[PDB]
Chains A and B, each alone.
Chain A
Amino acid sequence: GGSTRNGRDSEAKRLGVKRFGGESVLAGSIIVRQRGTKFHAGANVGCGRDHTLFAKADGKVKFEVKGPKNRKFISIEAE
């Protein structure tokens, strides 16, 4: 050719894995270049159309499978 380029996959890899947390703010399911795979639940209200679980808390991230089509939901855990 020409070229097949290869390019890059870039960094910015997953943060929303296992029981962990922040200290002042946590975005416990934030992801790049992907949308509509994860959702937010509980009483704390996360982000809009992206449904990322956001919290202003010292509390840890909760992972659940809930409702119709056993969908992936995210919340804050009580301790």
Chain B
Amino acid sequence: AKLHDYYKDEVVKKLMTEFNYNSVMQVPRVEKITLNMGVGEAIADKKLLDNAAADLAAISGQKPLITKARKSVAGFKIRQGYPIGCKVTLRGERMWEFFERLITIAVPRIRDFRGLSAKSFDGRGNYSMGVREQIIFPEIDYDKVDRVRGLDITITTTAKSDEEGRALLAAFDFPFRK
């Protein structure tokens, strides 16, 4: 696959051919991004978040899911059997296709971009790179917009180290805060 064919030999060599590494698949790689969008907060109107998931076609190319809640909770007016979000989460093929679209082209459209992720790493690719209100990806003929729209995204790996993950997130271009 066209992203990994480069990453498996041309970069991160310090965890493939240097000290304590002779196995080339022992370094972490990107496979999943935890993109989610909720709808269960609008449970008293029931129509406010009815078609919000149908206008994510600029941030997720996949078909949404119906979902169910985790627990029946009264002060959130929700039953366990009731819909809570729409998923739209990218794993595999459409995740690498989004990793080529994040922070690569919309570079003249940023508001501050002071470093994205600075802390809260742990071992599972815990690099939170969400926008804090969207910048809109370059697209044909758009003219009407809304307030307080954005996404939350972490590039979570099947790993146990974000110390070794700091070599993965230094194999590609990514800012960090200084």
In-complex A–B contact (CB below 8 Å) = no
A residues neighboring B (CB under 8 Å):
none
